Design a protein around this ligand. Structure first.
Ligand SMILES: NCc1c[nH]c2nc(N)[nH]c(=O)c12
Ligand SMILES: [Mg+2]
Lengths: 613, 1316
RNA sequence: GCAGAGGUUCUAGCUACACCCUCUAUAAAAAACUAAGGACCACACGA
DNA sequence: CTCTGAATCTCTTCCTCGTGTGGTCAGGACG
DNA sequence: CGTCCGAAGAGATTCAGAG
């Protein structure tokens, strides 16, 4: 009883079931703001029942608490009005069933909804790593004024724009809004409204609603972009820029501070993540929250208006695929003849078959991409001009909305070599794409790897939970106790290069890390960066301009604090974009940050020089 | 020619591959196994009689008496299956065993027995499998899933890699008995063979050999060949064989007769070996050095005194050679070791072995098996004999014998269950050969090595356990019992044998609660195979390899249908065409190919027999003469897919669907979708809840007929005939005279089960699908069951699907649904919840069921009757009182909150000797009247059939039919009839009818008396009232809905119909789906499914438009014929000219909703066929239809995909999963939330959640949740007062769980205290 | 319960943390006060 | 020739929450 | 009416052959 998960210390002491708590399935409800969420009417009445009883007593509607209990059972209109008052400013913690990272529990302002299902704002759904495949969230209600203030100050979703693990927006738009923006922020060689001159983005929106000009036609429209070059002052610049109507419309969503260059691109997923990061860096968090919410609304609306749809005719099977497969089969027969002739051994023959099949798979993929990504040829006020294809599936893949190029290659191109469960590659690959009927043997070979992956993912989750628990337990006793140790010692930070490429640029590694000593310029005796300065984006860029290859930087191992870590040594919080605040528990943050990706992690000469130097 | 249901509605089939074998009875595996378990077996093999023969010789020890089993008779059930379900008792048959007890002469066993005692005794009560295939064990249907366990026999494992941390492979041999102790031989890193029994500490392998009374010389002779060494003047030249020279370099000159074939220290080439044979010289010269490096194999005793010069297995030292030379041992026999071929593994173990005789070996065995026990000679002998040579303790099944013999290459199929000396030595020899590299290790994942133990075998084993228990009891009693004094019934106690079987059936790892959630779920669970259970792998013990699918699973176990979760691959579903072999191994039907022609005859192939042969692909083109169209056909030979010549292949897949199970087969276009999504979709189909209306799948596999008919949800026509009378409650068929048996026959009455509480709280509703006068053929489905439409399995609703992202409502996998769906009650499902209130014999008086409860609302009492039981059909809401149980001087059962609906039925149950209350008497009277009405009805229908037969031949015999009509038509016997061929039958019918009137009156009395007698109840309960609550759960936001292809999603919003998108024709799309799930989760079949559904609905719409107006029958007939032909070598090729105009009209009316399509799993429709079918309708062939927004009215760009995809609502409704509590009951550990939805419990804020708030700056919230919300006798009470006072102040206190920890550790003996 | 006694009610209601009222031998005039026994194991499913 | 590193023999864990189903001892006379 | 009747990883445990 004393020990183990069954044991009480793990069973209850570590994790205690709580009152004022409830579970329900998740629902999208995009209409909600990011800070707020959807809460069922009936669930709220049960969750906030003591608050309701107190408010009824203060109102005097209930003379006694026993009467208040009866009124809650009656569910009269007065009780529902009382619930609205309590729900107005009591934040509710929303917790995903596997809380791998701190983002798993985020407080929200509850909004009464008729449905019996909790609604989670769509942008934060990616942060929760949750889906809507009947996922269930535990909902807890903080009670005390300290608890409510803690929730609003830190727990609320608006506060945690950036993931603790990496200084990147964890509210990055995931599936539909990114697709809608990519359809919006796209160029066509010829479409109605092309070549027009527009007074402003408002006129672009009005033309689009009138239907005179499509979203993705290019026009010459002035853009009034405000520049934050003056620190804290906005300098308006108006210029005529050759952009699509859709990008002009989206420009209204963007606040004044951000430049127009960011919207002028295709705006896929990495692009929109960079846009959000730039917005957070340049403007305040509140403008960033408003910008993200407006992005989600506009993306959903224009995705719905777009009418993106996947169809069989949308899938394109390269005409060269059958010829390539026949050539590969002829090559395989030639290798088999060589094996029969005895020229090539069984192992060498198997290797050659694998190599030729891989080459054929690559050729099929390349042909499919050539006939998918730029296939559309559109008349352009004259000769027909090839343009990037608007195929919906290619739009999904290129925008990064959902599914990489590998999934599309499995879909329309031949699936390729599928290794049998032990690890050895099957000699005969799956030459049939998902669009065409797969042979029974092909399906069996595929299901080998599918079941292997499913079982390996189950044990991934198990081992990831174990590793996360171990990391939390070893690193629980780590809190920021001293603002500055003053330890001159520190680890040397340099970009890591394996020779093929720079795997990690120095900019990302030393970002938000306080220098161990004065950073001199490569020019001798020129101190570019002082001895103890936090490296924000400006400092990291400044180091890049002067090309400081090696920077010695403070580390948590370097600090001499006992039972604590130097605040300067830890560096940026990485979630709020400033030096770590005193008292924050970095240890649990880091343990959760390391443990969480474990699910994604898979369980199972001549010196060539790239460029002159 | 088609069946009437097929004539009523015939599914268009796009399958281009003809089938040679029909789908086998899906539940044959359970039914046949249990039947063999209970079938009277004259030869005593694989049945209860086999167990009786094995366990009942009963020769009393020193008692000179014997009790012998004779025959066993299954008793008639006390209650029927439905009666057993209602009353809650098990559906079991008492076992009547004829036992004969004979007493021999006084101390003369050879003397004949003096007298016999032959009589029948009740010996336990065995649950009977229903005709459906289930077991009713506590009033609830239970299905015993078949177990996949390691087949008994000898298996060899490499255990390579991690062992020895050196790359050396440590082969071990495991002999697993069906019953007994495991025998394991394992190799040490030092190449020492070690024996291990029952997974105990390892022992030298020689020890067991000594236990076989093998001397060391015998051991060397068995495990080693002996080279002969001859004493010669020429350095002791020895006879030798050239073949043994091959494979090693020579350390000496090979010279015979003065001719040196190979010189000193020369590598022996192949030419040298060959010339060594060509010389055929027997003696080969050997120097003193080479003979020295040898180990002797036999003891050599000096001639002078008889003392041994060399001991067995001792290295030949030079002085030993001199000692034997002076002794005169001319012939020397020493073991031959070739490190390449023959290693000295046995010899090294013998050197390590310290037990030099059988006595010491048995002493060591006794010490190891029973540590701390002083060894004894007879005790050790008995222990070893019981361990490996006793029939009762150790048993190898016939399957075990066959597997053991085949693995050891034994010619005889079966030997003896007990292990023999030759078997063990052969196992060791095989292990040695595997160590040498000869042969290969057995594969555990190989499905030939894994036999399926079905219900019959498991029941036989548990019955054997009960039999050995009762045998111990009866042998202890008989030995000291008085002779010829106690009857065998007195000697035999049925309690242990009954308890063993009851425990196995009611509660076991393999005994599972049957999920009646869906007829497909019912079929899958019955066929489902789980490796879990007794004698099987657990969740944690199983590694990746067992879960991973071995290519031998093809055609036996469905790769696609494996439950997701911790148990992935541990639980598997039987492939549709597979059926278990006689020995329990899986077999796949395969078509024999003589030279090139695929002969229609099918031979079932075992997994081991599959390997040697080569099997053709299912998608193998045929010329219609049986020859393969392709010269080279893709085939699988030894688990490898490679092309082969048409003549080479000798077997072919019987059908394309044999790879998948029943659940996976139902998925249409399964070939196109990814395996993972197919697995998920197959799992979702089981959880589909029967909708209010059963709608045929507009697109389907075509196996829905097989699943529906084989499942017991729908009644079938036992005998074909005309529907005399049909009702929602019951259907009467009058069988045709050819079907009718000559006597007491002519009608078949099927009492359809109305709304009944399912095992998963759904509704089992039997809806008639036929009316009066409809000709019903034999095997036809009279009434559709739940989720059944005209004999086709209808899990859900074919619903309009639009694949577009709509305002983000369908964000990740969410699903929009139009208010039209809710308005039409498309997915509304009836849920039956059974609430039981139990009156108990409490202290200070018993609880009172009568409505004497005070301090209750008058409205609540109004719903209750005078006795307190709620009136049938009274709508109630959560928190309303249903019964009148009173605490002895508020205990009355109330509706659980959030539960509502009419009370369909109240089954009051009264203990025997407890007077029924007013309402209970009325409920019993209603049951008595209903039983009387049903028995009178059965008598009346039996009379109607009897009257018709009697009247038919009454005219014969020269008596006016009208005169017999004036007499009672049945009782025409008073009027004499001249004898005729049927007159004797008619006289028998009338005499039987008169006797039947008395017999049926007695049957009516017995049935009524069974209701009248108080039902047996759990002790200490006066009465239990079973109130059934029925609620119409509808589509609610958050409800989990999934398609067959695995696109699971919750209902995001109940969108108004006008907001939903509409096409140009104005028809609003009912469901809008996110198209982004298609690319990543590569279930591209759902897009193909949607397109084909659109084509089918286009056909249905044209048919409906023809039907709406008045169209000539010829026009509609030719259009439907065009629909059913569609070219492309379709297998059906149905001709409508055969069908009559009425049949065509009925078919069209059935097709008015839509034209069903039978798309098989892997020979399904290609995209071109779907394009042609779309072209048949007015729909665009592209499959993309221009769509307009419902809200704005503006056309969407890029025309969307619209079509009907089958949609399933899953039982994980938001109603069940929604939960919350502010304050509620707490546990003993004072954790205020009890946990779970059933109790009013709060969600567990576990370690992950604690660390999550811990990483945040959350301290006050964490402290509050830990202390004041979980465990504080003062804080929880205080906080409540503070909140109702309006101030949110938290008193920290100290958690009660921490005090529990403190007191527990202090109890353990550790002084733990909180010092200041 | 000012102490003793009785108490409207809105289960039970000087302790559970409790609390208040009127009254002088024993119950009857009055409003404001407050949370209940659930242990373990298997099967299945959902995330 | 008495301790090398090395083979061996027990000990501990092996996610994280839901949701449903079920089944259950010690230990019977006894004055 | 009481009332007695796999798996894997790691730390002890030998143990041992060698300088
Ligand atoms: N718990 C005390 C109590 C019982 N009955 C009561 N009646 C009234 N008016 N006041 C009370 O305080 C009490
Ligand atoms: Mg999910």
């Amino acid at each position: 009883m004393i020990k183990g998960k069954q044991g009480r210390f793990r069973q209850n002491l570590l994790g205690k079931r709580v009152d004022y708590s409830g579970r329900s399935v998740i629902t999208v409800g995009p209409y909600l703001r990011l800070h707020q969420c959807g809460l069922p009417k009936k669930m709220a009445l049960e969750l906030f029942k003591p608050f309701i009883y107190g408010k009824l007593e203060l109102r005097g509607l209930a003379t006694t608490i026993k009467a208040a209990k009866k009124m809650v059972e009656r569910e009269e209109a007065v009780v529902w009005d009382i619930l609205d008052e309590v729900i107005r400013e009591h934040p509710v913690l929303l917790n995903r069933a596997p809380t791998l990272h701190r983002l798993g529990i985020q407080a929200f302002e509850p909004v009464l909804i008729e449905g019996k299902a909790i609604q989670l704002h769509p942008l934060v759904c990616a942060a929760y790593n949750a889906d809507f495949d009947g996922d269930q969230m535990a909902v807890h209600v903080p009670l005390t004024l300290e608890a409510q203030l803690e929730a609003r100050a830190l727990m609320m979703s608006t506060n945690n724009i950036l993931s603790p693990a990496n200084g990147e927006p964890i509210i990055v738009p995931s599936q539909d809004v990114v697709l809608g923006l990519y359809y919006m922020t796209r160029d066509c060689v010829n479409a109605k409204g092309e070549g027009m001159v527009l007074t402003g983005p408002k006129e672009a929106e009005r033309l689009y609603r009138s239907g005179l000009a499509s979203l993705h036609a290019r026009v010459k429209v002035r853009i009034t972009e405000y520049e934050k070059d003056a620190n804290g002052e906005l300098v308006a610049k108006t210029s005529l820029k050759d952009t699509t109507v859709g990008r002009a419309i989206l420009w209204m969503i963007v606040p004044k501070g951000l430049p127009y260059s960011i919207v002028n691109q295709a705006l896929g997923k990495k692009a929109i993540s960079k846009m959000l990061n730039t917005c957070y860096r340049i403007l305040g968090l509140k403008p960033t929250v408003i910008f993200a919410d407006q992005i989600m609304y506009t993306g959903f609306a224009y995705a719905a208006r777009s009418g993106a749809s996947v169809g069989i005719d949308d899938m394109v099977i390269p005409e060269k695929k059958h010829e390539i497969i026949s050539e590969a089969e002829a090559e395989v027969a030639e290798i088999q003849e060589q094996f029969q002739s005895g020229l090539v051994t069984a192992g060498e023959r198997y290797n050659k078959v694998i190599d030729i099949w891989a080459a054929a798979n690559d050729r099929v993929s390349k042909a499919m991409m050539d006939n998918l990504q730029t296939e559309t040829v559109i008349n352009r006020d004259g000769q027909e001009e090839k343009q990037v294809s608007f195929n919906s599936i290619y739009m999904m893949a290129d925008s990064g909305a959902r599914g990489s190029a590998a999934q599309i290659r499995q879909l329309a191109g031949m699936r390729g070599l599928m290794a049998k469960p032990d690890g050895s590659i099957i000699e005969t690959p799956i030459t049939a794409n998902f669009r065409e009927g797969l042979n029974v043997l092909q399906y069996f070979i595929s299901t080998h790897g599918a079941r292997k992956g499913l079982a390996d993912t189950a044990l991934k989750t198990a081992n990831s939970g174990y590793l996360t628990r171990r990391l939390v337990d070893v690193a629980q006793d780590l809190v920021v106790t001293e603002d500055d140790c003053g330890t001159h010692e520190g680890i040397m930070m340099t970009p890591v290069i394996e020779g093929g490429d720079v795997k990690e640029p120095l900019r990302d590694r030393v970002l938000g890390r306080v220098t161990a000593e004065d950073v001199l310029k490569p020019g001798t005796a020129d101190i570019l960066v002082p001895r103890n300065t936090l490296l924000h984006e400006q400092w990291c860029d400044l180091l890049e301009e002067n090309s400081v290859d090696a920077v010695k930087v403070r580390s948590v191992v370097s600090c001499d604090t006992d039972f604590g870590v130097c605040a300067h040594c830890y560096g940026r919080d990485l979630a709020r974009g400033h030096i770590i605040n005193k008292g924050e528990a970095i240890g649990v943050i880091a343990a959760q940050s390391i443990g969480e990706p474990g699910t994604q992690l898979t369980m199972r000469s001549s010196i060539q020089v790239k460029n002159k130097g | 020619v088609y069946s009437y249901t097929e004539k009523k509605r015939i599914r268009k089939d796009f399958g281009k591959r003809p089938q040679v074998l029909d789908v086998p009875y899906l539940l044959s595996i359970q039914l046949d196994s249990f039947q063999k378990f209970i079938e009277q077996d004259p030869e005593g093999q694989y049945g209860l009689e086999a167990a009786f023969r094995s366990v009942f010789p009963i020769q009393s020890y020193s008692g000179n008496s014997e009790l012998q089993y004779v025959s066993y008779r299954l008793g008639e059930p006390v209650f029927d299956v439905q009666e057993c379900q209602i009353r809650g008792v098990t559906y079991s048959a008492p076992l009547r065993v004829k036992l004969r007890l004979v007493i021999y002469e006084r101390e003369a066993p050879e003397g004949t027995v003096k007298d016999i005692k032959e009589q029948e005794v009740y010996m336990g009560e065995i649950p009977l499998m229903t005709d459906n295939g289930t077991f009713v064990i506590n009033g609830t249907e239970r299905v015993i899933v078949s177990q996949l366990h390691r087949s008994p026999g000898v298996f060899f494992d490499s255990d390579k890699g991690k062992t020895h941390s050196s790359g050396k492979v440590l082969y071990n041999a495991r002999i697993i008995p069906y019953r007994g102790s495991w025998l394991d031989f394992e190799f040490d890193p030092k190449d020492n063979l070690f024996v291990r029994i029952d997974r105990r500490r390892k022992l030298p392998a020689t020890i067991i050999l000594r236990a076989l009374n093998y001397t060391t010389e015998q051991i060397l002779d068995l495990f080693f060949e002996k080279v002969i060494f001859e004493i010669r003047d020429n350095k002791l030249q020895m006879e030798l064989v050239p073949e043994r020279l091959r494979g090693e370099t020579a350390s000496f000159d090979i010279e015979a007769n003065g001719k040196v074939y190979v010189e000193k220290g020369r590598r022996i080439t192949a030419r040298h070996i060959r010339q060594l044979e060509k010389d055929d010289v027997k003696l080969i010269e050997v120097p003193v050095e080479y003979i020295a490096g040898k180990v002797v194999a036999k003891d050599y005793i000096d001639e002078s005194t008889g003392e041994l010069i060399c001991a067995a297995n001792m290295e030949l030292s030079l002085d030993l050679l001199a000692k034997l030379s002076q002794s005169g041992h001319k012939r020397i026999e020493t073991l031959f070791t070739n490190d390449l071929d023959h290693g000295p593994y046995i010899s090294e173990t013998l050197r390590v072995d310290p037990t030099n005789d059988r006595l010491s070996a048995l002493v060591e065995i006794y010490r190891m098996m029973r540590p701390g026990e002083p060894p004894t000679r007879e005790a050790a002998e008995s222990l070893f004999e019981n361990l490996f040579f006793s029939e009762d303790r150790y048993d190898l099944s016939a399957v075990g014998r066959m597997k053991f013999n085949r693995s050891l290459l034994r010619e005889e199929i079966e030997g003896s269950g007990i292990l023999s000396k030759d078997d063990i030595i052969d196992v060791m020899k095989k292990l040695i050969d595997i160590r040498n590299g000869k042969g290969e290790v057995d594969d555990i994942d190989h499905l030939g090595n894994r036999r399926i133990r079905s219900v019959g075998e498991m029941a036989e084993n548990q019955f054997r356990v009960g039999l050995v228990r009762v045998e111990r009891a009866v042998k202890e009693r008989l030995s000291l019992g008085d002779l010829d004094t106690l009857m065998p019934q007195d000697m035999i106690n049925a309690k242990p044998i009954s308890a063993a079987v009851k425990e196995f059936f009611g509660s076991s790892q393999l005994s599972q609660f049957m999920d009646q959630n869906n007829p497909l779920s019912e079929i899958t669970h019955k066929r489902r195979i789980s490796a879990l259970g007794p004698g099987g792998l657990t969740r944690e013990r199983a590694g990746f390899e067992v879960r991973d699918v071995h290519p031998t699973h093809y055609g036996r176990v469905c790769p696609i249908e494996t439950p997701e979760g911790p148990n992935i691959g541990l639980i598997n579903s039987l492939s549709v065409y597979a059926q278990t072999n006689e020995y329990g191994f899986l077999e796949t039907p395969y078509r024999k190919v003589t030279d090139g022609v695929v002969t229609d005859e099918i031979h079932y192939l075992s997994a081991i027999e599959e390997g040697n042969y080569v099997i053709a692909q299912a998608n193998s083109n045929l010329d219609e003469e049986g020859h393969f169209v392709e010269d080279l056909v893709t085939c699988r030979s030894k688990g490898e897919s490679s092309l082969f010549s048409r003549d080479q292949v000798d077997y072919m897949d019987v059908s394309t669907q044999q790879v998948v199970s029943v659940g996976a087969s139902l998925i249409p276009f399964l070939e196109h979708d990814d395996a993972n999504r197919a697995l998920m979709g197959a799992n979702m189909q089981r959880q589909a809840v029967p909708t209010l209306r059963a709608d045929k799948p507009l697109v389907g596999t075509g196996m829905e007929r097989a699943v529906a008919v084989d499942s017991g949800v729908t009644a079938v026509a036992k005998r074909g005939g005309v529907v005399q009378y049909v009702d929602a409650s019951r259907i009467v068929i009058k069988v045709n005279e050819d079907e009718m048996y000559p006597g007491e026959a002519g009608i078949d009455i099927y009492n359809l089960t109305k709304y009944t509480r399912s095992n998963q709280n759904t509704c089992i509703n039997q809806m008639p699908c036929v009316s009066l006068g409809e000709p019903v053929e034999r095997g036809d489905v009279l009434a559709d069951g739940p989720s059944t439409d005209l004999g086709e399995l209808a899990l859900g609703q074919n619903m309009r699907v639009a694949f577009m992202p709509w305002n983000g409502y369908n964000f990740e996998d969410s699903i929009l649904v139009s208010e039209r769906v809710v308005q039409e009650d498309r997915f509304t499902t009836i849920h039956i919840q059974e609430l039981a209130c139990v009156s108990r014999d409490t202290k200070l008086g018993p609880e009172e069921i009568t409505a004497d409860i005070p301090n209750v609302g008058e409205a609540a009492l109004s719903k209750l009757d005078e006795s307190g039981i709620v009136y049938i059909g009274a709508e109630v809401t959560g928190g309303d009182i249903l019964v009148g149980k009173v605490t002895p001087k508020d205990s009355s059962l109330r509706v659980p909150n959030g539960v509502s609906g009419t009370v369909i039925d109240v089954q009051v149950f009264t203990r025997d000797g407890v007077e029924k209350d007013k309402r209970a008497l009325e409920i019993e009277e209603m049951q008595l009247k209903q039983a009387k009405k049903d028995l009178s009805e059965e008598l009346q229908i039996l009379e109607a059939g009897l009257f018709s037969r009697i009247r038919a031949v009454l005219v014969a015999g020269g008596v006016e039919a009208e005169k017999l009509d004036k007499l009672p038509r049945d009782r025409w016997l008073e009027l004499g009839l001249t004898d005729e061929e049927k007159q004797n039958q008619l006289e028998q019918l009338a005499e039987q009818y008169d006797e039947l009137k008395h017999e049926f009156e007695k049957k009516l009395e017995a049935k009524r008396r069974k209701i009248t007698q108080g039902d047996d109840l759990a002790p200490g309960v006066l009465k239990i009232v079973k109130v059934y609550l029925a609620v119409k759960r509808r589509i609610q936001p958050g409800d989990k809905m999934a398609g067959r292809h695995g696109n699971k999603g919750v209902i995001s919003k109940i969108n108004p119909i006008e907001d939903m998108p509409y096409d140009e024709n104005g028809t609003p799309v009912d469901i809008v789906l996110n198209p982004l799930g298609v690319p990543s989760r590569m279930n591209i079949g759902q897009i193909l499914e949607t397109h084909l559904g659109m084509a089918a609905k286009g056909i249905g719409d044209k048919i409906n438009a023809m039907l709406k107006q008045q169209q000539e029958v010829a026009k509609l007939r030719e259009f439907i014929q065009r629909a059913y032909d569609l070219g492309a070598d379709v297998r059906q090729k149905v001709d409508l000219s055969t069908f009559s105009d009425e049949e065509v009209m009925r078919l069209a009316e059935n097709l008015r909703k839509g034209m069903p399509i039978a798309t098989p799993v892997f020979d399904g429709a290609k995209e071109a066929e779907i394009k042609e079918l779309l072209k048949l309708g007015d729909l665009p062939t592209s499959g993309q239809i221009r769509l307009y927004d419902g809200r704005t009215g503006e056309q969407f760009e890029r025309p969307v995909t619209v079509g009907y995809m089958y949609m399933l609502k899953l039982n994980h409704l938001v109603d069940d999963k929604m939960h919350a509590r502010s304050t509620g009951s707490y546990s003993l550990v004072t954790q205020q939330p009890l946990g779970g939805k059933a109790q009013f419990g709060g969600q567990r804020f576990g370690e992950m959640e604690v660390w999550a708030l811990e990483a945040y700056g959350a301290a006050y919230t964490l402290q509050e949740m830990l202390t004041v919300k979980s465990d504080d006798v003062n804080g929880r009470t205080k906080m409540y007062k503070n909140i109702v006072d309006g101030n949110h102040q938290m008193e920290p206190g100290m958690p009660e769980s921490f005090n529990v920890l403190l007191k527990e550790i202090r109890s353990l003996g550790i002084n733990i205290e909180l010092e200041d």
